[PDB]
Amino acid sequence: CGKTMLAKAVAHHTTAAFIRVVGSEFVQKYLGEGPRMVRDVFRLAKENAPAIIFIDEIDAIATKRFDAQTGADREVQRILLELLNQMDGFDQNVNVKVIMATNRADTLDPALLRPGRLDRKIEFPLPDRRQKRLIFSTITSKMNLSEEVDLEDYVARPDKISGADINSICQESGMLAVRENRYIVLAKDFEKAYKTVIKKDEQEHEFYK
Amino acid sequence: KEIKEVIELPVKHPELFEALGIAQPKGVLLYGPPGTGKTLLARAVAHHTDCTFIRVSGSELVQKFIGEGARMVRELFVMAREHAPSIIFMDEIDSIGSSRLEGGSGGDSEVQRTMLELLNQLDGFEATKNIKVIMATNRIDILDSALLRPGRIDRKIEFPPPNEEARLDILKIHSRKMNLTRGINLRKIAELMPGASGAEVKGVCTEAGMYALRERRVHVTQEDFEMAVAKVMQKDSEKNMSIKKLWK
Amino acid sequence: GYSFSLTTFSPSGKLVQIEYALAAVAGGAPSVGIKAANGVVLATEKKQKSILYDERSVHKVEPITKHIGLVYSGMGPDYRVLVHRARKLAQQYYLVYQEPIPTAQLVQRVASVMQEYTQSGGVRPFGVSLLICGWNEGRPYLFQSDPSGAYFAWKATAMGKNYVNGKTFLEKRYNEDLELEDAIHTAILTLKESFEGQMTEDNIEVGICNEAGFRRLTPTEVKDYLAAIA
Amino acid sequence: SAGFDRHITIFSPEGRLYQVEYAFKAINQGGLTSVAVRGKDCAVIVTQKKVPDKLLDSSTVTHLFKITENIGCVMTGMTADSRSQVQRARYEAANWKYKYGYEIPVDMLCKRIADISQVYTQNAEMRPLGCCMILIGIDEEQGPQVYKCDPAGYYCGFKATAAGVKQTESTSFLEKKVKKKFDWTFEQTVETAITCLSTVLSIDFKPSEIEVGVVTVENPKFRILTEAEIDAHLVALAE
Amino acid sequence: KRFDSEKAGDREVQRTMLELLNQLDGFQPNTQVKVIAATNRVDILDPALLRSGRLDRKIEFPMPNEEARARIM
Amino acid sequence: GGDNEVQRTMLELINQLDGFDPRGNIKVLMATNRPDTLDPALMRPGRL
Amino acid sequence: SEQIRELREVIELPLTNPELFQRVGIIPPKGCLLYGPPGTGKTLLARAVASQLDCNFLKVVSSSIVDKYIGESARLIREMFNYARDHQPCIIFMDEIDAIGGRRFSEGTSADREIQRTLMELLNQMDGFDTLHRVKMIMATNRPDTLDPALLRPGRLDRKIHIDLPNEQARLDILKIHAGPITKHGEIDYEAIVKLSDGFNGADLRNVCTEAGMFAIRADHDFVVQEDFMKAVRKVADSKKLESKLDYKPV
Amino acid sequence: PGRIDRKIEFPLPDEKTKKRIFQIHTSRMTLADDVTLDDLIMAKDDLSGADIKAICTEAGLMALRERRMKVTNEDFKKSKENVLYKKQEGTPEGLYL
Amino acid sequence: MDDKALLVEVQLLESKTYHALSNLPKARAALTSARTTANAIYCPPKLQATLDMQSGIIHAAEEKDWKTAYSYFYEAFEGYDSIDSPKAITSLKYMLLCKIMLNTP
Amino acid sequence: RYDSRTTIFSPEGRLYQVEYAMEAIGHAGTCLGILANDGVLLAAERRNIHKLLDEVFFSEKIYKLNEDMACSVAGITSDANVLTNELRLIAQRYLLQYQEPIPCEQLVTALCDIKQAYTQFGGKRPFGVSLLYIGWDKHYGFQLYQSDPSGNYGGWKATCIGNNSAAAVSMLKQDYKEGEMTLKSALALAIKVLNKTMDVSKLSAEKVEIATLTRENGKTVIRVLKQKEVEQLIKKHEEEEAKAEREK
Numbered sequence A: 001c002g003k004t005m006l007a008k009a010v011a012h013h014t015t016a017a018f019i020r021v022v023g024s025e026f027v028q029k030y031l032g033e034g035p036r037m038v039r040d041v042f043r044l045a046k047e048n049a050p051a052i053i054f055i056d057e058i059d060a061i062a063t064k065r066f067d068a069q070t071g072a073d074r075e076v077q078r079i080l081l082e083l084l085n086q087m088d089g090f091d092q093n094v095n096v097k098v099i100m101a102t103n104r105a106d107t108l109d110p111a112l113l114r115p116g117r118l119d120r121k122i123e124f125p126l127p128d129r130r131q132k133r134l135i136f137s138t139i140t141s142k143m144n145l146s147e148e149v150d151l152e153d154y155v156a157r158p159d160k161i162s163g164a165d166i167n168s169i170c171q172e173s174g175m176l177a178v179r180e181n182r183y184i185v186l187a188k189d190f191e192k193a194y195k196t197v198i199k200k201d202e203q204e205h206e207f208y209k
Numbered sequence B: 001k002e003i004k005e006v007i008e009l010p011v012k013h014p015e016l017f018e019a020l021g022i023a024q025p026k027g028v029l030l031y032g033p034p035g036t037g038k039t040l041l042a043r044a045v046a047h048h049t050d051c052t053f054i055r056v057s058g059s060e061l062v063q064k065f066i067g068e069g070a071r072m073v074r075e076l077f078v079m080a081r082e083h084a085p086s087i088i089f090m091d092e093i094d095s096i097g098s099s100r101l102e103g104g105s106g107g108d109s110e111v112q113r114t115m116l117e118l119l120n121q122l123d124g125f126e127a128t129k130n131i132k133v134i135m136a137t138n139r140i141d142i143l144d145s146a147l148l149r150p151g152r153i154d155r156k157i158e159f160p161p162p163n164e165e166a167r168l169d170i171l172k173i174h175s176r177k178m179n180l181t182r183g184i185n186l187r188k189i190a191e192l193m194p195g196a197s198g199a200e201v202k203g204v205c206t207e208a209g210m211y212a213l214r215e216r217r218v219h220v221t222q223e224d225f226e227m228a229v230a231k232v233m234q235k236d237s238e239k240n241m242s243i244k245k246l247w248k
Numbered sequence C: 001g002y003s004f005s006l007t008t009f010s011p012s013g014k015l016v017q018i019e020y021a022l023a024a025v026a027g028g029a030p031s032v033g034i035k036a037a038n039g040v041v042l043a044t045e046k047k048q049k050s051i052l053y054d055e056r057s058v059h060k061v062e063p064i065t066k067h068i069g070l071v072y073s074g075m076g077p078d079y080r081v082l083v084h085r086a087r088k089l090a091q092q093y094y095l096v097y098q099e100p101i102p103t104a105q106l107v108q109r110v111a112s113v114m115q116e117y118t119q120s121g122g123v124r125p126f127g128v129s130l131l132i133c134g135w136n137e138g139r140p141y142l143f144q145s146d147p148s149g150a151y152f153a154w155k156a157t158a159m160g161k162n163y164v165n166g167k168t169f170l171e172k173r174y175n176e177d178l179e180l181e182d183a184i185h186t187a188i189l190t191l192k193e194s195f196e197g198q199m200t201e202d203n204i205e206v207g208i209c210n211e212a213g214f215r216r217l218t219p220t221e222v223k224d225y226l227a228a229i230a
Numbered sequence D: 001s002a003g004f005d006r007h008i009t010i011f012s013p014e015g016r017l018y019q020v021e022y023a024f025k026a027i028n029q030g031g032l033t034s035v036a037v038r039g040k041d042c043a044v045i046v047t048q049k050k051v052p053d054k055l056l057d058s059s060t061v062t063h064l065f066k067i068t069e070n071i072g073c074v075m076t077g078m079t080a081d082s083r084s085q086v087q088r089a090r091y092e093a094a095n096w097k098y099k100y101g102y103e104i105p106v107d108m109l110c111k112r113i114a115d116i117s118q119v120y121t122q123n124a125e126m127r128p129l130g131c132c133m134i135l136i137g138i139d140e141e142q143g144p145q146v147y148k149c150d151p152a153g154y155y156c157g158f159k160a161t162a163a164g165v166k167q168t169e170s171t172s173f174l175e176k177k178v179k180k181k182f183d184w185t186f187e188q189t190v191e192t193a194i195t196c197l198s199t200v201l202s203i204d205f206k207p208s209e210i211e212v213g214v215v216t217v218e219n220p221k222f223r224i225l226t227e228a229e230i231d232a233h234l235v236a237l238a239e
Numbered sequence E: 001k002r003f004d005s006e007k008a009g010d011r012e013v014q015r016t017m018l019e020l021l022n023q024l025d026g027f028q029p030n031t032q033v034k035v036i037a038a039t040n041r042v043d044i045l046d047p048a049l050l051r052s053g054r055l056d057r058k059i060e061f062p063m064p065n066e067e068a069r070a071r072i073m
Numbered sequence F: 001g002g003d004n005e006v007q008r009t010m011l012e013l014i015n016q017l018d019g020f021d022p023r024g025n026i027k028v029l030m031a032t033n034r035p036d037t038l039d040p041a042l043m044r045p046g047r048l
Numbered sequence G: 001s002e003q004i005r006e007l008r009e010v011i012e013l014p015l016t017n018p019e020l021f022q023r024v025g026i027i028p029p030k031g032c033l034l035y036g037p038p039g040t041g042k043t044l045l046a047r048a049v050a051s052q053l054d055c056n057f058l059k060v061v062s063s064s065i066v067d068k069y070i071g072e073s074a075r076l077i078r079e080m081f082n083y084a085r086d087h088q089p090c091i092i093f094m095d096e097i098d099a100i101g102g103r104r105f106s107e108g109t110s111a112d113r114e115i116q117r118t119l120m121e122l123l124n125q126m127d128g129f130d131t132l133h134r135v136k137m138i139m140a141t142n143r144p145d146t147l148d149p150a151l152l153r154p155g156r157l158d159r160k161i162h163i164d165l166p167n168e169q170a171r172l173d174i175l176k177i178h179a180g181p182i183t184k185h186g187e188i189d190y191e192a193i194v195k196l197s198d199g200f201n202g203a204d205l206r207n208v209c210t211e212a213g214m215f216a217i218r219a220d221h222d223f224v225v226q227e228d229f230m231k232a233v234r235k236v237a238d239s240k241k242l243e244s245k246l247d248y249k250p251v
Numbered sequence H: 001p002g003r004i005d006r007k008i009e010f011p012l013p014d015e016k017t018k019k020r021i022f023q024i025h026t027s028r029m030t031l032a033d034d035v036t037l038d039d040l041i042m043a044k045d046d047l048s049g050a051d052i053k054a055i056c057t058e059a060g061l062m063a064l065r066e067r068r069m070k071v072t073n074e075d076f077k078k079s080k081e082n083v084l085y086k087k088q089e090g091t092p093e094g095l096y097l
Numbered sequence I: 001m002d003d004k005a006l007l008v009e010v011q012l013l014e015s016k017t018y019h020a021l022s023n024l025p026k027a028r029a030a031l032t033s034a035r036t037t038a039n040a041i042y043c044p045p046k047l048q049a050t051l052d053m054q055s056g057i058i059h060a061a062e063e064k065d066w067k068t069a070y071s072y073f074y075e076a077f078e079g080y081d082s083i084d085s086p087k088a089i090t091s092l093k094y095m096l097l098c099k100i101m102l103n104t105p
Numbered sequence J: 001r002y003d004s005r006t007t008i009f010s011p012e013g014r015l016y017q018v019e020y021a022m023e024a025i026g027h028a029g030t031c032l033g034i035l036a037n038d039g040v041l042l043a044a045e046r047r048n049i050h051k052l053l054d055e056v057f058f059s060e061k062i063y064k065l066n067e068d069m070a071c072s073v074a075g076i077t078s079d080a081n082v083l084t085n086e087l088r089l090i091a092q093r094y095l096l097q098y099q100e101p102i103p104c105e106q107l108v109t110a111l112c113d114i115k116q117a118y119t120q121f122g123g124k125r126p127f128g129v130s131l132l133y134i135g136w137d138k139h140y141g142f143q144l145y146q147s148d149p150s151g152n153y154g155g156w157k158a159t160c161i162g163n164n165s166a167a168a169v170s171m172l173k174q175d176y177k178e179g180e181m182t183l184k185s186a187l188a189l190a191i192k193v194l195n196k197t198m199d200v201s202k203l204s205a206e207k208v209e210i211a212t213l214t215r216e217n218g219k220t221v222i223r224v225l226k227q228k229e230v231e232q233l234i235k236k237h238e239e240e241e242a243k244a245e246r247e248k
């Protein structure tokens, strides 16, 4: 739904020190390296300018919800404890900002969700009407279409499309004219590129409906 | 006032415990649900202690190599003998200090290897003096029953969610620099929180003043708060109800 | 995880395999059912994977007696078992009492059938939830069973995929008093919320309850009903 | 991810179950493909044979199986599970005539087959028969029909039918094939039933490598084609 | 399997390993300085590091079947 | 990684136990409490 | 013959003609996925793309960049572009895209995103989105159990193609290549080899012509008689049948 | 044996030697004559020797908390509560009888 | 009170007259309160396009957003498709005006 | 561990599967019966009172069972319908045999022997259902009984359910009456106890349920009293709060 693009759009028109970190390279082996990489970010951040710390995904480790009576799950659990200690531990105030992005947010820790730590909650819908028009306009604005084939016949369609797959449609019809040696889209291929990417039903075995 | 009895009183007046004839306490545990003032009380003491304050977060005692991930804890507390009155603080012992599990390729040895040194530099062959520890975390039943013994920690202090009389006083502190107009009742707004955390009273105070920012306004009405109550307070929203009625 | 099985508890909560059986219910085809003032309307979603599948072969709205119908959201192969169970069970009331069985009485007994496969262990529970309708003694009824064995009495509900969008639709939609003809109008309008692209006379399949008995609609009316009525 | 239910038949956390859907890839060790086509008042089965030995016979190879005098079928999947599936089909077709006094419909028989395959999924402790079955038959006031039964207990009747290894390639050909409104006059049926299998497998077979079962409104008896007239339809499409 | 570190350790063994790899590709395969190697476990060795013109011929030694036991005894 | 340097000493013990240049008159006695967890390279007769 | 050219102009036309990528405007065509057997296909038809210009090649082992913290790996991206900047479209040959030391299973033990920490950053930062001068990448591997569902967008694996192992007639093509610089009489019925051959692997039919020379070392054949190839099939193809672990499929 | 020849159990105390624990830890404190040591011993039968030192220090803090030097029974009533509330509620319900 | 659909009328009609008296930010706040009120009604089968026109009006009064306000005018015309013709014919006047002002004539 | 089937003791007498079922009922509904001379009552709680249900039965927690007895229920609903159809079928077997109603104790022990028998036999489950008993007999009059998953039981004069409402038992002792046990004195006690335990304030009538049983002319009528007279019972207690603050 256009999540990381919004983080990239902030990095242009800011005067900050933008720091993006994937939430996967600290869930690794070598017990103790995980929580120290959290310290390596913030000591690099708080020594520097007003900065933005964009953690890409924590749909991975973000949830306690049980006491781990096992091995190597308390190491999973304690990275959150290190994350909480240098988020809303001491004051640590001056000009540090943290942005996170996930899937469904009911899974994760309620200790994260108190305000003062994660004050803002923003939900993303998909491509509803009047927003399919705006994304079709802007992508085809910087694209020589040059036909009398109206695109709004695909605005008014059902089969709701994620915002990344709109980008796939206009680029596929770009391939589906140039590969056939056309210096302009003729938009008889635009039907076929639409029907191509919409077929993600796969198999489902015609079973359990 | 209980923290004055264990930290201020032995440092300021040690001769009282001489005349009364008891040993002096040194162990403090702070517990409760999240967002109930556990870390201000560390910083409020540290602003007024007139003493050495040693901050240790509870997760850097593992490093990466065995044996040196432990011994600096022994080098930590022996450095506190240099500044002979001192207060050492623990951040969030839901890490190291949890439980002695089994052997095998499960649990962890090295977490226990560090924990046994914490278990012993304050209760070993040599008893220390003028060094006091404060530990603060939730999850009371899952830290180990060898540092919870009252030879180690003498004061266990809860932090319940505040009362309606107490939610009013928290609301007055953060709305102090906030500028309210007139005709506004904080007690009505304090009754709109059926069991708030107390830390989320700030989230009401920030989001109510945020409504005036998008209006290019400095005036804050009571309507700004009542919209901010429904924004901050949420629910789990347990859907499909089949889980509920399997479990009636 | 503890689970792995059905004949033991977890140390903290409840039976986990029954909760996993409800996950197959949510991954099924969507469905809707609305109880109006004079009847109950059932409507479901039915799309083939290809243009080759004959749509008039296997049906979704399935009558039990001449005044009782039934739909589902789950797996169709498990659905055909308890339908054939509910047919023969409904005749056993009629051989004893010589009277058509009330709709509150099957749901006592059909849920006790789905009860029995949650026992033993060497067996699996169903992966099907149901919706049962009927107009007995003037007032119509609309119930819902589950693989755990409980049951309900709904005004309006929706199962299958994207049921939370249909529920917040119907929470904003369903009033107390409408006729059956207005009830089908808001029953297709909630099927259009989560359906796929084309919606023809063969993509949906709708049955109703009058006081004149149970009836499922032929596609001649359903084409004429979906013809520009929203 | 899997783990949880990949040995026995129980549920997976939120998803489905794997032992039944491992039987769907248990057809593909046969190394075979079958095609059924219903266009108009007739019905055609076509399936190739694969004879890897000269000492191996010819008559004991055919997968076309006569269930009743008006109902024939074809079997895919592994061989030994296929024939025991046919023994139940021959058995319960005769119980209908005994209990009820008339010829069983082709629609009613796949209900009785898939319900037996249903219990083996619901109740455990029997391997669920990794084979697939396709039926044809003539019904009064309904025309000819083509049905498919699945190892999961699913069934659905449909016009153009593929099975075996190459469903997704043959059905992709037949979707583009059955979209124009051409009539199907009993040789339009067969020639499309040949050339679909002939291009998807890419064999354009020699005459002695297949089988063709047929049924037609005129003579409703199930009929296996003679090798001579198989050559007659093969020289018909390539004029 | 070579692994990265920060305290030397193995960070001379690859300089001994690659010198074996550089010399073996250093000369053309003209049979006169044929090289024989033998290990007990294959799963330690670097398979993509041999594979073409390095140590290449696989001579496995299976266990004696029946009569090969009776021969050795 | 792990017990790398221990393996180099342990495999050097093996090649001066059997291999080229057999030792002759050198008798080796070993004793353990946990014999299950030993290397099959030492379990071969000719070495033990 | 179908795959010499299907891969050719899907690489040639975007690099030769970037001006059509402003006549409609998209920079994105970043190469095919060559998946199938090991065979000879991964190494030999990469040299078939080398037929016009091409050259570059270099090598991608798919292992020296896959180090865990990707602050080094992003420098290891641009370290290889220190020579790819020295030219026109350089053609980064990339071997074993999906292969780690050992095997790769699903997300259990170390069979994890160690590729995809690097891999999703490559198609971001190597070429396409972050690019320099229409350099072309050619993905080629045969193992891959775990993959990106976002890899199937136009711009990472724009079109995919599968390599098959048998033909029974491209045997005879590859056979006469390997029955080339070996001394004989011209006595050979090469199709009599092929009908008696059951190898089903192009790299292993290379082994068949090797062992027929070993039968020529036997019995002092400075030539190679037609029997030596029939001797070679019975030795080589029987040795292929006596190996386990026969489950491999690229996704 | 050969390495360690003695294995020594240290069990939790009794109702007899527990008197000696309370006697020694109340050596040099001003003890009012209202108290009975056997009140807290006999009524509750579970608690360690390190518990008893915490009770004696807490009851001394209660005297300064309400402006006293001597220590009465009401100090030990509040101290025996406050020390022991760190160990959970119970095990099983009345199955056994 | 408890009735809801009359609130959406009086919130939108005030957002007309605050804009008619040339008060821009107060008409913004009255429109925003009309949006969050209009999220809980069975159907605004015609009032949606009435709401979506003046979403475009106040957004055009910024003289800053000449693309999304065009989308609000166009959605208002689609709601006015042959079921309210006098309000439909004025919808072309605003959406062509927004396309002139976007310098794409 | 020892979390296998229920046919295996732990190292020391601690049947873990029985203990897991006896803790499961705390996360369920809330039921209580009170003392009464010349009567008895039950009180229950309406869970998940969402506005798209019918309640066609108008009796969900309460099941009238023979003629002069009813029962509450708390636990797994799948096992709840099995027991009630079994328990009604016990009382008619006794009535066919002696032509006299079942005397309210050996009905309970007949179920408790069934509920026990699933703890010794096979790899299945115990019943995860505890439930109450109200009734009248010739020998002792009005009675109360308390079922358990283990098959243990016991008579009571006032009782409730655990981890949901275990604090109500402290209130029942603090506001205990003995002798002055009329029905109106007990209904006022019932709405006060459900006020604190049900944490939703002001106690809407659609969240509760009250069922009584009296003795009138030798008939023993059973009342599930309607929602109209719940209203004037709640507002009576709401009036008593405004009267109780006169001491303040």
Ligand SMILES: Nc1ncnc2c1ncn2[C@@H]1O[C@H](COP(=O)(O)OP(=O)(O)OP(=O)(O)O)[C@@H](O)[C@H]1O
Pocket: A084, A088, A111, A116, B033, B034, B035, B036, B037, B038, B039, B040, B041, B092, B170, B173, B198, B199, B202
């Ligand atoms: N009683 C209070 N008065 C004023 N502010 C409070 C109060 N309680 C909490 N806060 C606010 O909560 C924040 C501090 O969090 P706190 O000290 O509760 O740590 P904590 O939330 O207990 O730690 P954790 O997040 O690990 O639970 C500060 O913003 C502080 O202003």
Ligand SMILES: [Mg+2]
Pocket: A003, A004, A005
């Ligand atoms: Mg993203």
Ligand SMILES: [Mg+2]
Pocket: A088, A089, B038, B039
């Ligand atoms: Mg804190």
